[PDB]
Design an enzyme around this catalytic site. Structure first.
Site, PDB file in Angstrom:
ATOM      1  N   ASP A   1       0.844  -1.200   0.000  1.00  0.00           N
ATOM      2  CA  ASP A   1       0.000   0.000   0.000  1.00  0.00           C
ATOM      3  C   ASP A   1       0.880   1.250   0.000  1.00  0.00           C
ATOM      4  O   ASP A   1       0.972   1.976   0.990  1.00  0.00           O
ATOM      5  CB  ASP A   1      -0.988  -0.036   1.171  1.00  0.00           C
ATOM      6  CG  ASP A   1      -1.914   1.166   1.189  1.00  0.00           C
ATOM      7  OD1 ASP A   1      -2.009   1.876   0.178  1.00  0.00           O
ATOM      8  OD2 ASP A   1      -2.583   1.372   2.216  1.00  0.00           O
ATOM      9  N   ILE A   2       1.660   1.397  -1.073  1.00  0.00           N
ATOM     10  CA  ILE A   2       2.670   2.450  -1.152  1.00  0.00           C
ATOM     11  C   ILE A   2       2.015   3.709  -1.745  1.00  0.00           C
ATOM     12  O   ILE A   2       1.574   3.690  -2.895  1.00  0.00           O
ATOM     13  CB  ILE A   2       3.855   1.987  -2.035  1.00  0.00           C
ATOM     14  CG1 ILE A   2       4.378   0.628  -1.531  1.00  0.00           C
ATOM     15  CG2 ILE A   2       4.963   3.087  -2.132  1.00  0.00           C
ATOM     16  CD1 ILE A   2       4.655   0.579  -0.025  1.00  0.00           C
ATOM     17  N   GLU A   3       1.943   4.782  -0.964  1.00  0.00           N
ATOM     18  CA  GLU A   3       1.191   5.972  -1.383  1.00  0.00           C
ATOM     19  C   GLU A   3       2.017   7.245  -1.531  1.00  0.00           C
ATOM     20  O   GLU A   3       1.531   8.237  -2.058  1.00  0.00           O
ATOM     21  CB  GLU A   3      -0.006   6.200  -0.456  1.00  0.00           C
ATOM     22  CG  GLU A   3      -0.985   5.042  -0.518  1.00  0.00           C
ATOM     23  CD  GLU A   3      -2.202   5.219   0.373  1.00  0.00           C
ATOM     24  OE1 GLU A   3      -2.378   6.314   0.936  1.00  0.00           O
ATOM     25  OE2 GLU A   3      -2.980   4.247   0.533  1.00  0.00           O
ATOM     26  N   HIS A   4       3.278   7.199  -1.117  1.00  0.00           N
ATOM     27  CA  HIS A   4       4.170   8.348  -1.250  1.00  0.00           C
ATOM     28  C   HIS A   4       5.577   7.826  -1.018  1.00  0.00           C
ATOM     29  O   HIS A   4       5.780   6.632  -0.750  1.00  0.00           O
ATOM     30  CB  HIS A   4       3.814   9.463  -0.203  1.00  0.00           C
ATOM     31  CG  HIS A   4       3.815   8.991   1.223  1.00  0.00           C
ATOM     32  ND1 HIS A   4       2.671   8.921   1.993  1.00  0.00           N
ATOM     33  CD2 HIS A   4       4.828   8.572   2.022  1.00  0.00           C
ATOM     34  CE1 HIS A   4       2.976   8.449   3.191  1.00  0.00           C
ATOM     35  NE2 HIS A   4       4.283   8.256   3.243  1.00  0.00           N
TER      36      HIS A   4
END
Length: 273
Positions: A125-128
């Protein structure tokens, strides 16, 4: 299909055992390992559920086993909306994969944060942060499957295609399940009266990437996300009949267990999924 749920970010949402015992969920992502990379000591964050110091979170292994016994797959989710996670290099990808293997999967560690249970896989869940090396991390984790027990790989990209962080990793064709987040993103989410943007985006995803199954990810309550909440009736009447036509359709993902309880979202949609 089935419902995937994120659990771990609100101590009041119930134990992992209770969560699995609802019989509403087919997959559970444990949220989050939100600090790792760049020489940092990895730290799991399960809000109020438990404190991982001194093996305070090993009790979670009870919930993991109980889920698995009922045929539910349990993943550890990396990243999330808050955290200083990153990968500094390809060596960092390797170090992180080895850490995950020994501490959550089939390897060995004297300090496994969630105890002795072996998780089914890893959720991205890589968001930044860094857009680099996530594909290497996926390759390295995937190699550990060769030892005998499959390591499932899952991902939660945001709906704008392609995803800036996970696009390259998803192009590898290693991912089993991908639950696209159709919220916090106006151009591809539901907006009052308009389902075109979401169907159009779903069509892009399902035609574009090679993964086992693709899931429609939604907030379980209006409070759960900045924007993109879809009332269950609209979902059931207008959205599901269209998206279920895809052979890649896997079901629906919800953020998160806490909000689902409050809003009764999965109870309302369960048989339609």
């Amino acid at each position: 299909g089935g419902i995937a749920i994120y659990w771990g970010q609100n101590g009041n949402e119930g134990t992992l055992t209770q969560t699995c015992s609802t019989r509403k969920y087919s997959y559970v992502n444990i949220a989050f390992l939100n600090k790792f990379g760049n020489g940092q000591t990895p730290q799991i964050n399960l809000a109020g559920h438990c404190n991982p110091a001194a093996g305070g979170c090993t009790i979670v292994s009870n919930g993991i086993r109980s889920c698995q016994i009922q045929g539910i797959k349990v993943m550890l989710s990396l990243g999330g909306g808050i955290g200083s996670y990153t990968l500094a290099s390809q060596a960092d990808a390797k170090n992180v994969a080895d850490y995950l293997w020994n501490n959550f999967l089939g390897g060995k560690s004297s300090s496994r944060p969630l105890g002795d249970a072996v998780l089914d896989g890893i959720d991205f869940d890589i968001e930044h942060g860094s857009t680099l090396y996530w594909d290497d991390l996926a390759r390295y984790l995937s190699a550990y499957s060769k030892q005998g027990k499959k390591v499932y790989l899952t991902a939660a990209p945001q709906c704008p295609f392609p995803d800036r962080y996970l696009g390259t990793a998803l192009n590898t064709g290693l991912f089993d399940y991908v639950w696209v987040q159709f919220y916090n993103n106006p151009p591809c989410q539901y907006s009052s009266g308009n389902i075109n943007n979401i169907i159009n985006s779903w069509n892009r995803w399902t035609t574009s990437i090679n993964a086992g199954k693709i899931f429609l990810g939604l907030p379980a309550a209006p409070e759960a996300a900045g924007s993109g909440y879809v009332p269950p009736d609209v979902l059931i009447s207008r959205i599901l009949p269209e998206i279920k036509k895809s052979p890649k359709y896997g079901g629906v993902m919800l953020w998160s267990k806490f909000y689902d309880d409050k809003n009764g979202y999965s109870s309302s949609i369960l048989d339609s999924v």
